[PDB]
């Protein structure tokens, strides 16, 4: 008592854990739909097959999708099965018939896998080379801005109509570019030496800029600068200091 009651009032904590869930609400078919269809089915004699699910609430799905897309990993909604994030279907919203839910979270999960893989790569750097390191640095530089916007949206779900289709639509011209990066980098991560494994990546970069040469061009440019930055430094050094110094034969011109 007295902390438990304080909890029960101003805190919810019952839908991302194994507790019964309710939400105070005013049903009447347009938002009771899933239960309406369930009762229709049960009257229709399926035969039975119970629909025991824990009932998730609505706005908090929107908290989960902002968190997944922003860059942090491992949520309640959106679990992994082999290391690739996918929708869980053990939760039910009062409406949507539980089939639209699987689709909408599947497409958002398709974005979430893209950010999941990149954040996995960047986390496995902090637990010579200087190019992949120089590329994850540029990727992180884009990532902090991308995360800031989605976090800024997340604050107003504490501070306003709440629906799925607006918060995805507001992020459409970022989630478009997010898919492009997943194809540009995947061909620059294919493949031994630290100079071959940099060369196919950089050549992929210079080739993929000319394809789009909107907004995506500036996105690939901001990554281009921060990977050619080591090379130009050692080139300048080779000019004025005369000798070529690039340790472990990182320079593509054999000295």
């Amino acid at each position: 008592p007295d902390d438990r009651s304080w909890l029960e009032h101003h805190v919810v904590h019952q839908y991302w854990t194994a507790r019964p869930s309710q939400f105070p609400h005013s049903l009447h078919l347009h938002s009771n739909l899933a239960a309406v269809w369930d009762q229709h089915l049960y009257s229709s004699d399926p035969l039975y097959v119970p629909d025991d699910r824990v009932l998730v609430t609505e706005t908090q799905v929107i908290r989960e999708t902002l968190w997944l897309l922003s860059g942090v990993k491992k949520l309640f909604i959106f679990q992994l099965i082999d290391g690739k994030v996918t929708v869980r279907n053990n939760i039910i919203v009062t409406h949507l018939t539980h089939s639209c839910l699987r689709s909408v979270l599947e497409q958002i999960a398709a974005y979430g896998q893209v950010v999941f893989r990149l954040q996995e790569f960047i986390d496995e750097v902090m637990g010579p080379f200087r190019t992949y390191q120089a590329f994850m640095w540029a990727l992180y530089k884009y990532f902090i801005s991308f995360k800031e916007e989605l976090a800024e949206i997340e604050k107003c779900i504490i501070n306003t109509t709440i629906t799925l289709a607006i918060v995805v639509d507001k992020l459409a011209p970022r989630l478009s570019q997010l898919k492009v990066l997943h194809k540009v980098f995947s061909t620059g991560v294919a493949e031994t030496r630290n100079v071959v494994r940099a060369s196919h990546l950089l050549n992929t970069l210079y080739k993929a800029i000319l394809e789009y040469d909107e907004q995506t061009v500036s996105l690939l440019f901001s990554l281009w600068v921060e990977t050619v930055r080591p090379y130009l430094q050692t080139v300048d050094e080779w000019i004025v200091h005369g000798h070529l110094w690039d340790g472990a034969r990182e320079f593509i011109i054999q000295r």
């Binding site: 050619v228 930055r229 130009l232 430094q233 080139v235 300048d236």
Partner: peptide, 4 residues
């Protein structure tokens, strides 16, 4: 440098 050349970069800057």
């Amino acid at each position: 440098e050349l970069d800057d």
